[PDB]
Design a protein around this ligand. Structure first.
Ligand SMILES: Nc1ncnc2c1ncn2[C@@H]1O[C@H](COP(=O)(O)OP(=O)(O)O)[C@@H](O)[C@H]1O
Length: 135
């Protein structure tokens, strides 16, 4: 789920593009502090927001996760990425959650939609809103 101050595009960026630290335990604190819980796993794509926006321009395809959605797009090429896996749940005090990190170079599929009319900058009429899968 996402905090109210974020549009889907900004939340996508916060969760999958802006890895604030190369260490998952530190990077995941941002996501967990916003979601008020420790996300079991999360993928950080080591690419630019602009690159993802352009991927939104690639041919539409069915989303591997939801066979009813047709707003997904394949990256075309592989990109470096870090996958974070929760290793220490820490019931109370989510800042104590620890994660393992898995580096890899894979293709990705993202779902994109028109920008939030009121909050997203007009610069990008089309933006990624969900990471559907990595291959
Ligand atoms: N095809 C889709 N198009 C637009 N929005 C979607 C789509 N699929 C899922 N969503 C929404 O986007 C949210 C973002 O999920 P996300 O953070 O990307 O999941 P995770 O990173 O745990 O895989 C979902 O919880 C859902 O409400």
């Amino acid at each position: 789920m996402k905090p109210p101050q974020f549009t889907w595009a900004q939340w996508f960026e916060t969760q999958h593009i802006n890895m604030t630290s190369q260490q998952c335990t530190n990077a995941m604190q941002v996501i967990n502090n916003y979601q008020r819980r420790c996300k079991n796993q999360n993928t950080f794509l080591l690419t630019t927001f602009a690159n993802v926006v352009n991927v939104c321009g690639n041919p539409n395809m069915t989303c591997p996760s939801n066979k009813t959605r047709k707003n997904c797009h394949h990256s075309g090429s592989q990109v470096p990425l870090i996958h974070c896996n929760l290793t220490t749940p820490s019931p109370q005090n989510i800042s104590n959650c620890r994660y393992a990190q898995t580096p890899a170079n894979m293709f990705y599929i993202v779902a994109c939609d028109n920008r939030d009319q009121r909050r997203d900058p007009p610069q990008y009429p089309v933006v990624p809103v969900h990471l559907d899968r990595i291959i």
